[PDB]
Amino acid sequence: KIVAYELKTGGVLLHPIFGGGKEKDNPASHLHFSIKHPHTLSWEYYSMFQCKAHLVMRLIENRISMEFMLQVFNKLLSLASTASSQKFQSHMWSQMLVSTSGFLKSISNVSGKDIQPLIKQWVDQSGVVKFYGSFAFNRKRNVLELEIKQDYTSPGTQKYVGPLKVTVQELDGSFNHTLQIEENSLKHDIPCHSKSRRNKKKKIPLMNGEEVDMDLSAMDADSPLLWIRIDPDMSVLRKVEFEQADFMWQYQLRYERDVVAQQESILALEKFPTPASRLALTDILEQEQCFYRVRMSACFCLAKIANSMVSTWTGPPAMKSLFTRMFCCKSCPNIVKTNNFMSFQSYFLQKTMPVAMALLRDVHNLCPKEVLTFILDLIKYNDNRKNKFSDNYYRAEMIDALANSVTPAVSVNNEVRTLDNLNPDVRLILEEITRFLNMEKLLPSYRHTITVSCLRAIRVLQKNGHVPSDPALFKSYAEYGHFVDIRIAALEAVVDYTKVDRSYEELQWLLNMIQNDPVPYVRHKILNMLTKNPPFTKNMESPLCNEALVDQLWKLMNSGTSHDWRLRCGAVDLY
Amino acid sequence: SVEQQLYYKEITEACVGSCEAKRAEALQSIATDPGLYQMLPRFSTFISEGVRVNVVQNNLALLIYLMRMVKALMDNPTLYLEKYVHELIPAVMTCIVSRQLCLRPDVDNHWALRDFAARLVAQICKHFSTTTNNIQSRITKTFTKSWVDEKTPWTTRYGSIAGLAELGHDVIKTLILPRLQQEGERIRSVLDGPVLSNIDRIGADHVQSLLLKHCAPVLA
């Protein structure tokens, strides 16, 4: 995720981590945040400042080893800074001041070479975008030749190290590799590895099954060359440019041992144009050693790829297979109160099997009857559950399931008007959408279901548009006080509805409710969310041309002086 | 279940509440809602217990609300009331005949409990008597016994004869016409008597009116 934000140069939208206030700091266009007062310290818990500090500390471990940096930080905690005067006055500080100048030195002494350069190309003008791949394989020599360039569109561009591994997979995906590539334009020579380094683990007694000689008709035709899978384990954090990539994604889906690769090999299966893998990645649909999220984004492959042509409804039986994930609803849902749902094998993955359906429904508009049939059965499963801890995640990402079911279902748009007389849908779907009005809300200390059941309310009333029904809940729901969650749930949907609404009055009332609501921290939340979603579109008619907002702006500056150090960089962004 | 228990609770809560608007709403609900078939015999059991208790608290309002609730059940086309006819009859009969339904105010309040109870027994007779056989003889014997007992107060008698009168024209002719002259001599007893005063004036007006106006159509 930090890569997404570090692929951004030229006005938007990146910052340094090591922020040294020097006198001659001439480039502050993109650094607005010093590190001077108060709120510029508060704002270095933004995601780049956390998990890119995380990232760099994980690297420096591997260079200065782990046992050594252990002895480092264990001494640092118990290294004592005393004060001692000649009338015997013993002072003790640790639990008492310690310095970062001697931190630098201590790790330097133990382990490592030049750390000034390396850390300089995390904070300043460094890192890469795109790695160019091109391939060859020559029959006569058995030498399989790779040509990896690398490329970085920005002012201040260089050539960079990034350990870039490749593992070639023979006829039956039973190969090996290594590689390194760390110069700008490199051509690297991979020796006569017809037989893998694991020639006889049980790797190639697979092509040595009977596909060494029987399919020597299609190995001695090396036109299907040795299939060079690209970037294991996100080994270098780049955008790859690598023609003909379907086999590479499959081979990483099946035979890779680290699942960091896999979840990215199915993000690439999702997006890059791939021939039929659908039956094969059902292996990794139910590989019961795999993460919640790789089983999820294995469903989301079939979701994204979404038919291509007119075998749309041939995907779908495999989807409704794990639409009943061994769902035994003849004892359920009365003994699934008693169970923990068995997570239903992660409800991240159950969500995105009826949401593979729903994406397919969205993408091609000759689906929608059969999907509706599918997701009608998910609705028959519902309204029979009680409260259970794990089953919050089921309910919460089944309300995203049920949204984008009525959403395609009335995607004959032209306003909402009224949706004419679709009582069958609107009633029943609102019945799940709203809360049980008998059921008191002073009992659950959590609220998930009805946080994302105002979201089931919106987005089924956003794809058409029932304007003033939505905020007329969320205003009431952030006044009454009870339930911290519920309040934020309401306030996040009052700004998701302003994100669509573009009558000026609603934005006025929204910066009034920013001003004084008067929880200070929910005040920030709203202020940032209006600062994220802009009030203009492509057109540029009176851009940022206000007079009273700019007074409010300067009056929200120096409310740092009072407290909230995430309010004044609200102002700082809208300055 | 949570939803069925909640609506049960809410309807019982609305029975005792002085909110006569909210009890009237609970009556409408019990006649109009589908799905109630499991919340039969829990209703009826809690109604019949409440009718015992409130007979021995003289609370006419609670008793009329419980009669109205039994009527709503009996009228609800989504409730198969038959099985529980044999419970609802002796509760409703206890309201018609009861020696301690004191109708002690303004007759309107507790004349209207005996009377309303009798109108529910009259529905139940006219709807189930054919199908059950037991039901007609059980009811007619208990009401005839009351009305014809010299030693049962005006209030018990008037209740039983109102019930008889409204059961059926053919019951009026057969029980109540031949009994008419015998009961006006013996047990004029003015209403079985005091018991009476102006409640043999209004209640033996009503008896002579309902006798004249079921005599006239059983002739016609």
């Binding site: 309204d383 019945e431 009005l437 | 279940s1 909640l6 609900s29 809602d33 799905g35």
Partner: peptide
């Protein structure tokens, strides 16, 4: 009153669903 009616309807629906489930099991 309206709210109460809605609640009742919901309860009825739930009951129906339960019945259906039972039938399926049978």
């Amino acid at each position: 009153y309206q709210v109460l009616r809605e609640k009742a309807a919901s309860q009825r629906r739930d009951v129906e669903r339960a019945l259906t489930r039972f039938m399926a099991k049978t």
